[PDB]
UniProtKB/Swiss-Prot annotation:
This is BarH-like 2 homeobox protein. Residues 2-61 bind DNA. Coiled coil: none annotated. Potential regulator of neural basic helix-loop-helix genes. The gene is BARHL2. It is found in: Nucleus. The chain holds residues 231 to 292 of 387 of the full protein. Belongs to the BAR homeobox family. It comes from the Eukaryota.
Length: 62
DNA sequence: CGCTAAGCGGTT
DNA sequence: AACCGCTTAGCG
């Protein structure tokens, strides 16, 4: 039953996440931890964004 | 509605 | 542990 609050990413955060995705389709644990730290996000928020972004990427190229 | 963050069951 | 492939649900 108990759900996490949906994260609202700042324009800055979305911009940097998208920049990271265009450089690298996947992150090492350490690059993920560095990006989360740089954008004041949690490791898991950045991991979930990567994964949602990969799904999107497969739809829009397929 | 459309986009997408988070949840679920199963893959590797 | 992280990913996949899909689903659920929040909000503009």
């Amino acid at each position: 039953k108990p759900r996490k609050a949906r994260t609202a990413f700042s324009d800055h955060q979305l911009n940097q996440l998208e920049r990271s995705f265009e450089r690298q389709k996947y992150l090492s644990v350490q690059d993920r931890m560095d990006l989360a730290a740089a954008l004041n996000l949690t490791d898991t928020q950045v991991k979930t964004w990567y994964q949602n972004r990969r799904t999107k990427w497969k739809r829009q190229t397929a």
